[model samples]
Target: FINYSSREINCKIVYYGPGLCGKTTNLQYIYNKTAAETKGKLISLSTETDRTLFFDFLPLSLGEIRGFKTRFHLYTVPGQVFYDASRKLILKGVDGVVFVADSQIERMEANMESLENLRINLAEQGYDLNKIPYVIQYNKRDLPNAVTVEEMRKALNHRNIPEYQAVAPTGVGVFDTLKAVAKLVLTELK
Candidate 1:
């Protein structure tokens, strides 16, 4: 959600995808990379399993833009789930969704199912899937190449929402996804 004031524009971006698909991993990296002076602590809301939770945060403050200070607030809800109403609270006032689809073949059914969940869930919430700033991160690249870029694109690149080839274990494509979404939101700041 974009919090607009006379002097600045603040927004929230959520890293959403199926289980163990590196959503929390992204924020973990963000905290390490962000300057302490500019960022708040990365708060992790723990569940009983330490899985279903929230990472509500201000990674850091960016510079002024168009006479308005551009502040980006990032958040994650591991409880952010499909099939149930759990993710319901997470989408409130969200400015965008970056669906982190795992490229692992065994997991794509969950990937597809989660995508459908977001589509249906967001729609029911009165937010159009197309209107919200969106992107696809086909994360978890394995060794080898049975899936051609075209083949991968055909399978996972639904709506071609700025997909990235990524591996979350080593901080790869972290900024690629973050900057892409933030950059998109920045452009819509009018």
Candidate 2:
């Protein structure tokens, strides 16, 4: 569903993490930073409690890479416990996953559980962790109480998963994470 003539390769990328982990913030920052023509409509579906009711979508055209079009469809799943079903639905056809781990010490357990759940859910959808494109982004790095990148890697990506450090609010590490995953996804297509 992309225009290759315009050098746009439409690819879907999902941002997954527990509540208040800055998934939405990452998308907002990208929307603000990108040029208008390269960005598309932003759809936000939120409930009364301010939880993302469905998910957010941002279509971004990253120009051409070696003569191939590159467009990314970004998404963020609802991080609350009650939104597990929604998360699973949104992850249906995910091409690459950028797991945004909250670095706060108190939320460590939740982050781990959510990541486990992601693996299980992806398994249900016939995706193997080793086969699919994946990356981890240790977000909230700017917080004083945030866990170190090493600690996050040990806890969530112990298998030595590809990871990035991100402070979504200020847009730090955001593009790095996105580009990292995008590269992985494009590599897979080849």
Candidate 3:
């Protein structure tokens, strides 16, 4: 959604992960904290309760890129396999991506499976996860069952791209992940 004539560059950043990975919570925290003018409505387009199919419409003003004003639109995909087609559609025009992994010890398989699914879906769109501006987040870090940050990194952050540890509901590292990906997307635009 880059409009040179309008002097506005719109970016689509999608939050992706397995079910209960705190993808929705991350967006919710940002929407609540963002300044009123810079943010848009947090829309939850869901067919079922307790699941976010396409979430949030935060239009962030990340200063300017050359001369065109940059606006980042944040979104999240449904984290279940039942919505694979929906996930692929949400990622169609994504400028950047965030993989929010649930850090619990028992959820390791889910984390890996989701990561693989992300790669496959992105590939279908002709985007390589490594070639894209991507970042990873180990959410629920404060939980007792959460894995060690080092272990989580070794398991998922293989590309060595930007990563963060977060307790999404409490707003920890939420903005850090946002800013990290936003910077990469803007730099790619340049």
Candidate 4:
């Protein structure tokens, strides 16, 4: 939403993927690296035992566009398989999506399932993944058991949306993913 009163253009970008796919870590790395003045508090809705119950939220300032301050509200859907309700809710009014796929060979099925779920959920909200500004990140790229990049792309990047390889915890490709999506969103917004 754009707030004329505040001169702020607020955009939502959701990090989505399968369980333990480093969605949370992606947001955490960005939060950690962000300057205090440019970022709001990082909030995680979780259970009492450190389990993510809902999503992680981070409000970030990406400089400015014209006279308006461009603010991106980054969110990560809970990766647990049964959190479909939460995922749908978090996706409301999304400006862009970054799908972080687990690069491990064993997690391929889960990756595909989540990708399908993303499509279905977005459709239910009257949005098409094909029409949206979307990107894919192949995370955990350094894992010894990780599948080849070509294999991951064949499964997940059929649309050929902007994609990147990321290690997440060590911050590789985090900003690249963010910048790619942000650019698309802004271009669409214009």
Question: Per-residue CA lDDT of candidate 2, range 7-31, in tens?
Answer: 5456778888887898888887877
Model 1: per-residue Cα lDDT over 35-62, one tens digit each: 6666666666655433443334343446
Q: Of models 2 and 3, which has the larger lDDT?
A: 3
Q: What is the TM-score of each candidate against the true structure?
A: 0.83, 0.85, 0.89, 0.89
Residue 32's lDDT in candidate 1: 71
Q: Please give the RMSD to the true structure for each candidate, in Å.
A: 3.2, 3.4, 2.4, 2.9
Which pairs of residues have clashing backbones in candidate 3?
none
Q: Please say which candidate is ahead in lDDT: 2 or 4.
A: 4
- Displacement of residue 5 (Cα, Å) in model 1 is 8.4
In model 4, state the lDDT of residue 152: 80
Candidate 3 lDDT over residue span 1-190, tens digit each: 7676777768888888887888878877887777776666777666762344343343455555576677777777544647577777778778899999999888887899989988888888889888798899888888898778888778888768888878987899998888888878877886
Count of clashing residue pairs in every prediction: 3, 2, 0, 0
Each model's lDDT comes to: 0.70, 0.76, 0.78, 0.80
Q: Is candidate 2 or candidate 4 better by TM-score?
A: 4
Cand. 1 Cα-lDDT: 0.70
